[PDB]
C-alpha cells in the first residue's frame, strides 16, 4: 500500500500464494519471500517482517553474493537505494620504504532492510552481478557510529 | 657537572636545595598547619600557601593574608606543622 508508488505494480521475483486454513492455495494473499545469504550473514528482521519491495535486495530477491567481500564507511546517502562507500588503505612505495594514504569510492546498493543506515556508518559489502552502470556491490551489514549533527539517512 | 655525585641516594641538604620538581621523587614544599586564634583557643587548619583571607572558625580574627606564595600570618598567630 505504501510501496506501490510507481507506475507499475511492484511484485517480488518469487511471489507465491499461501495456503488457507482449509489446506488449499489462497489466491487472496502472497507469501513474503525471504532467503538467507551465505558466509555467516544473518538476515535482518526488516527483510522478514517488512513489506518493502526490491528486486536487488540480497535477502528478498534472486541476486546472489559472490566471492569478493569488502568493508568501508558510508560517504553519501543522497541517492535512492544507493550509497557511496569509501575505503581507506595504505599504498607501499618500494623506493622510499614508506606507505602513503589512498582512498577509493565504491557505489554500492543499499536495500531498504537497513533503515538506520546514515552517513559515517561502518558497512560490510559483498559483490554481486552488475546492478547499474557502476553499482556492483550490495550492503550485507552495518554498524552505527558517532554523530556529526548531520543525520543523513538512506 | 664534571664532578658527579650518586643519583640514587642524594643527601638531605642536596634534595632540599633543588627545585620542588627536580628532586629524585618530586615532593611539595608546602604543608598543612593549624593556627591557634589570638581571640580564642580554637585551631583552624589551613594550607601553607593559601590564596584567600583565613578566618577563624569562631570569629574572624583574620589569621592570615595571601601574598603570592605563602600565607602572611599575623605576628601573634602561633602554628605547628600537621604531620
Amino acid at each position: 500500500m505504501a510501496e506501490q508508488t510507481e507506475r507499475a505494480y511492484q511484485k517480488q521475483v518469487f511471489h507465491h500464494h499461501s495456503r488457507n486454513e482449509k489446506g488449499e492455495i489462497d489466491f487472496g494473499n502472497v507469501k513474503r519471500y525471504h532467503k538467507q545469504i551465505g558466509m555467516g550473514f544473518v538476515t535482518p528482521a526488516e527483510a522478514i517482517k517488512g513489506t518493502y519491495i526490491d528486486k536487488k535486495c540480497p535477502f528478498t530477491s534472486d541476486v546472489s553474493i559472490r566471492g569478493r567481500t569488502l568493508s568501508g564507511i558510508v560517504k553519501s546517502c543522497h541517492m535512492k537505494r544507493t550509497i557511496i562507500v569509501r575505503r581507506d588503505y595504505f599504498h607501499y612505495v618500494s623506493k622510499y620504504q614508506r606507505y602513503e594514504k589512498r582512498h577509493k569510492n565504491i557505489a554500492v546498493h543499499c536495500s531498504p532492510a537497513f533503515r538506520q543506515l546514515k552517513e559515517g556508518d561502518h558497512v560490510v559489502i559483498g559483490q554481486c552481478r552488475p546492478l547499474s552502470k557502476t553499482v556492483r556491490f550490495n550492503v550485507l551489514k552495518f554498524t552505527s557510529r558517532g554523530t556529526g549533527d548531520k543525520k543523513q539517512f538512506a | 657537572p664534571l664532578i658527579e655525585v650518586d643519583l640514587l641516594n642524594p643527601t638531605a641538604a642536596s634534595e632540599a636545595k633543588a627545585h620542588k620538581m627536580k628532586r629524585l621523587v618530586p615532593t611539595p614544599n608546602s604543608y598543612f598547619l593549624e593556627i591557634k586564634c589570638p581571640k580564642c583557643g580554637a585551631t583552624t587548619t589551613t594550607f601553607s600557601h593559601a590564596h584567600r583571607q583565613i578566618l577563624c572558625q569562631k570569629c574572624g580574627q583574620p589569621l592570615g593574608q595571601p601574598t603570592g606564595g605563602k600565607l602572611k600570618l599575623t605576628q601573634q598567630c602561633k602554628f605547628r606543622i600537621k604531620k
Binding site: 614508506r98 | 658527579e4 650518586d6 643519583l7 629524585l24 621523587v25 618530586p26
Partner: protein
Amino acid sequence: VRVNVLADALKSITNAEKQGKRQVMIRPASKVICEFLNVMMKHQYITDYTVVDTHRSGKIVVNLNGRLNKCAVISPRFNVTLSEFDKWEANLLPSRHFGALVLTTSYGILDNTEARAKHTGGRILGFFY
C-alpha cells in the same frame, strides 16, 4: 614535544659515556626502554639499572662501565623482513662480530642474533656497538 621517549633515553646514555660519566638518569621510563636496556645488559654493555617509581612514569638510573661506544635509536621502525637482516647489519653495524641490532617482535624485544634463531622479523628499534 617528546615524540620518541626511547630516542631521548639513548641520546642521554650515549652523551654520558662520551663524557666518561659513571651513571646517568632517564626521566621518562617505559616498557620499551626497559627492554632495550635488558638486551644491552645480556651483552654486558651496561652493569645494571634501577627504576624509581615517581607515580608519574618514573625515572631510570643506568650504570655504565666504559663499554658502550654508541647506542642510538632508529627513526620510523621499518618492517624488517627476515631476508632484510644482513642488509641492515651491513649498514648499521661496524663489523660481523662486534655489534647487535634490536628488534621488536611478537616474541618480545630481541637482538638480531636470537631473532634470527627464533625465525621471526619485526620492526627495528635501534643498535649499539
